[PDB]
Design an enzyme around this catalytic site. Structure first.
Site, short mmCIF file in Angstrom:
data_model
loop_
_atom_site.label_atom_id
_atom_site.label_comp_id
_atom_site.label_asym_id
_atom_site.label_seq_id
_atom_site.Cartn_x
_atom_site.Cartn_y
_atom_site.Cartn_z
N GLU A 35 0.81 -1.24 0.00
CA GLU A 35 0.00 0.00 0.00
C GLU A 35 0.84 1.29 0.00
OE1 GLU A 35 -3.03 0.12 -0.67
OE2 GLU A 35 -3.91 -1.82 -0.01
N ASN A 46 -8.23 8.57 -5.85
CA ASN A 46 -8.97 7.59 -6.63
C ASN A 46 -9.82 8.28 -7.64
OD1 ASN A 46 -8.05 5.26 -5.18
ND2 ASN A 46 -9.13 6.16 -3.50
N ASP A 48 -12.84 8.10 -8.20
CA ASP A 48 -14.11 8.52 -7.62
C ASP A 48 -13.99 9.73 -6.74
OD1 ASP A 48 -14.77 6.33 -4.70
OD2 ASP A 48 -13.03 7.51 -5.08
N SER A 50 -12.31 9.98 -3.93
CA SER A 50 -11.90 9.70 -2.55
C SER A 50 -10.34 9.68 -2.58
CB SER A 50 -12.41 8.38 -2.01
OG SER A 50 -11.93 7.28 -2.78
N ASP A 52 -6.83 7.84 -0.53
CA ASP A 52 -6.24 6.89 0.40
C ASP A 52 -5.03 7.51 1.16
OD1 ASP A 52 -6.39 4.54 -2.21
OD2 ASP A 52 -7.94 4.89 -0.74
N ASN A 59 -9.14 4.69 3.11
CA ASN A 59 -9.87 5.48 2.11
C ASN A 59 -10.92 6.38 2.76
OD1 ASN A 59 -10.48 5.67 -1.00
ND2 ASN A 59 -12.44 5.36 0.09
#
Ligand SMILES: [Cl-]
Ligand SMILES: [Cl-]
Ligand code: NA
Ligand code: NA
Ligand code: NA
Ligand code: NA
Ligand code: NA
Ligand SMILES: [Ti+4]
Length: 129
Positions: A35, A46, A48, A50, A52, A59
């Site tokens: 990650e 992301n 969308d 959002s 992380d 997220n």
């Protein structure tokens, strides 16, 4: 902060993540590796909208508040910035909620695709724990 491999394993154990919900420490270290490459300041946007955050790339759609994810929740009850700290407490506490949520560590797509089923004890091999 960029952790060393054994250094992170030790911090994760200290905060109770070792064998949490049955996932050995090596699972958690592996997930962190893929990650964030062990960097607490890692962020990823992301498609969308959002984002992380942190060592375990938690997220903002469900887990933290960043003020810029429309329609999202903050189930860990923290600003997403708390996830970038050199002190991993907030990340670990929030990861415990995420892994308890029903799909276990499959919540972390990278864990599923790069850690799941592999020799995850390699991630803690050699460490004094
Ligand atoms: Cl908000
Ligand atoms: Cl918003
Ligand atoms: Na490494
Ligand atoms: Na392990
Ligand atoms: Na949020
Ligand atoms: Na720490
Ligand atoms: Na992946
Ligand atoms: Ti928001």
């Amino acid at each position: 902060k960029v952790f060393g491999r054994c250094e992170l394993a030790a911090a994760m154990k200290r905060h109770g993540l070792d064998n949490y919900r049955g996932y050995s420490l090596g699972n958690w270290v592996c997930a962190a590796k893929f990650e964030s490459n062990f960097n607490t300041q890692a962020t990823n946007r992301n498609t969308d909208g959002s984002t992380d955050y942190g060592i375990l790339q938690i997220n903002s759609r469900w887990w933290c508040n960043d003020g810029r994810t429309p329609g999202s929740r903050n189930l860990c009850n923290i600003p997403c910035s708390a996830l970038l700290s050199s002190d991993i407490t907030a990340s670990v506490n929030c990861a415990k909620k995420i892994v308890s949520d029903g799909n276990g560590m499959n919540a972390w797509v990278a864990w599923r695709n790069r850690c799941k089923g592999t020799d995850v004890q390699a991630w803690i091999r050699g460490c004094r724990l």
